[PDB]
Amino acid sequence: RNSAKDIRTEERARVQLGNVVTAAALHGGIRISDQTTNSVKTVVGKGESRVLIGNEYGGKGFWDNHHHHHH
Amino acid sequence: RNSAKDIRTEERARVQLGNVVTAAALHGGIRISDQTTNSVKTVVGKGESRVLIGNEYGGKGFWDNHHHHHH
Amino acid sequence: RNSAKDIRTEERARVQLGNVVTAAALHGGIRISDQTTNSVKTVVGKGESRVLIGNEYGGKGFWDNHHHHHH
Amino acid sequence: RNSAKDIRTEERARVQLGNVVTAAALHGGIRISDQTTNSVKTVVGKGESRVLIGNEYGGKGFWDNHHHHHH
Amino acid sequence: RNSAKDIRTEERARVQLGNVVTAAALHGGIRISDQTTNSVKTVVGKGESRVLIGNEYGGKGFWDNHHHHHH
């Protein structure tokens, strides 16, 4: 699960509290198991900062596309 | 599941409580063992900040628009 | 399930409770998934702030997005 | 499992609290569960900074790196 | 376990705290436990800073490693 205490997002910033499911995630079943526990105390973002509190599911790189492409 | 406490939005800020499903998610994989609880205490959004409390199902962009050049 | 406890909307602020079905996601079919509990305690919106209590269904834009500026 | 005390992100900086699950993975060992513990106290990033707190699963080579082995 | 006190990343920098798992995963090992102690005190990086605190396991040979067969 995910848990956050204090998140500050100003100056055209944006924050998302959840998981990201891309249109590539079409393979999965129902299985109840253990899930990693990720939690943050304080996050201060300034200047179009983007806060992602959760896990990301993608195939084309990651959350954003700035560096490290396909080999 | 989400659990928010205090969310403050000022200066033309906008906040949404819930999940976002896109047209690309139409007839796809909505259930892939998404077992997680996203809890948050204080969220600050000043300066046209956007607050998204929930998970998304898009693919054609991670909520916002980001495009750069790697190496 | 979408729910809220206290919402403070002031200074040309607006609040909506329920769900939003954008025309980009077909007509108002209603009842598609809803597999998460979305509840917030206190939401403060001052200064043209927008408070949306519910999930949306769209593909043209993520609720509020019309930017065409590349970085 | 993963815990962060204070994280500062400025100037188009972004931070993700979770893990990176790529589409290169499938129903075969994807349930990494809870193994090692990663706890950071102070994280400061300014001017295009990316904070990744979590593990990565897939054949993307590496989440974000500069290049390969150089001479 | 992996712990870090102070991490500073400025000017196109990134900090990754976690373990990397290649698409091939581990060739067995039903007892996945952490048997390494990595405590980071203070690391400052300005200008193309790559901070990786965790376990290396990919298949390239830079910030990662593998076995591979030579011929």
Ligand SMILES: O=C(O)Cc1cc(-c2ccc(C(=O)O)s2)sc1-c1ccc(-c2sc(-c3ccc(C(=O)O)s3)cc2CC(=O)O)s1
């Ligand atoms: O704000 C709370 O009360 C704490 C908190 C808040 C959550 C929820 C938010 C709203 C909910 C609600 O509305 O009820 S519940 S869950 C919960 C905890 C879970 C995990 C914890 C850890 S421990 C820590 C580490 C970070 C660094 C380390 C170091 O320096 O040693 S240890 C971070 C987190 C996260 C954190 O404390 O913010 S606290």
